[PDB]
Amino acid sequence: AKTLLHKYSDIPEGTECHRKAYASTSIGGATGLIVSAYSIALKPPASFLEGVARTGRYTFTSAAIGAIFGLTSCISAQVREKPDDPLNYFIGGCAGGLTLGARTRSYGIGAAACAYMGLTAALVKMGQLEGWQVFAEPKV
């Protein structure tokens, strides 16, 4: 639940890349499990082996994306000596996007995923820096 997010967030950015990558891999695996559950519910896989294969495929894809994103973002934040910079998250974003393109075996998806995941990750970094609120507590 919330624990997986704070496990990633508690590690400082450009440090301990192994632990940051493990946390991102766990987050990705959870996301892939949720996607697999909904996909199996709304589109039955015609047998148990096919359901297991589809679930493993989706979960491995998501976990691989998370691992690559975390590893490259931490490494970039540590070699450039510039943590708190959204460019590291953009580079991680196309790390994950190119991973997705490789997993689905298509160049167009890979390039689109570079662009969109990198932009989204850089935006998330900007929101962390500036305190943007996705869900805002009512105050007025």
Binding site: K2, I34, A41, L42, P44
Partner: protein, 55 residues
């Protein structure tokens, strides 16, 4: 190359393709209650733990 192909490809054609794909994915439910009541069960379970187990 630019005006008729790539400028079309990046802004409007990409948007139309993505929305069409998402619409097809969303609307292609056969109408069997056995599938989306199981979906309801998954949704209820997630809510209890993801949003409920941290208040």
């Amino acid at each position: 190359l630019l005006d008729l192909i790539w400028l079309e490809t990046i802004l409007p054609k990409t948007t139309s393709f993505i929305q069409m794909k998402m619409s097809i994915m969303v609307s292609n439910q056969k109408g069997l209650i056995k599938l989306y009541f199981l979906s309801f069960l998954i949704t209820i379970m997630i809510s209890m733990t993801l949003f409920n187990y941290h208040e």
